[PDB]
Amino acid sequence: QYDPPTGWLWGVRPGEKYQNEGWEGPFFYGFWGSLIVFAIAYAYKPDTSIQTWALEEARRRLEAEGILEDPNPT
């Protein structure tokens, strides 16, 4: 035999319900909400890292060698 799952999440007994303390709206809609909105906006932030700039040049530098057959024969 098995028992049904039990317990008081957040310590709220089955008779009662959870009571808001005052930090919930600011934390969920503000701090967490801003962090999510920041995440999607980060997906559109243009790339500004030194690698992707240097990969482009280094690609050309190795292209003018025996490595990395370039698309155009100039």
Ligand X SMILES: CCCCCCCCCCCCCCCCCC(=O)OC[C@H](COP(=O)(O)OCCN)OC(=O)CCCCCCCCCCCCCCCCC
Ligand Y SMILES: CCCCCCCCCCCCCCCCCC(=O)OC[C@H](COP(=O)([O-])OCC(O)COP(=O)([O-])OC[C@@H](COC(=O)CCCCCCCCCCCCCCCCC)OC(=O)CCCCCCCCCCCCCCCCC)OC(=O)CCCCCCCCCCCCCCCCC
The residues that touch ligand X, with contacts defined as CB under 6 A, are 30, 33-34, 37-38, 41
Q: Is 38 in the site for ligand Y (CB under 6 A)?
A: no
Report the alpha-carbon distance of residue 49 to residue 29 in Å, rounded.
31
3-class secondary structure per residue, 4-67: CCCCCHHHCCCCCCCCCCCCHHHHHHHHHHHHHHHHHHHCCCCCCCHHHHHHHHHHHHHHCCCC
Q: Is 26 a binder of ligand Y (CB under 6 A)?
A: no
If one asks whether residue 28 binds ligand Y (CB under 6 A), the answer comes out as: yes
What minimum distance in Å lies between the beta carbon of 44 and ligand Y? 14
Q: Which residues bind another protein (CB under 8 A)?
A: 1-11, 13, 18, 21-24, 26-27, 30-32, 34-35, 38, 40-64, 66-68, 70-72, 74
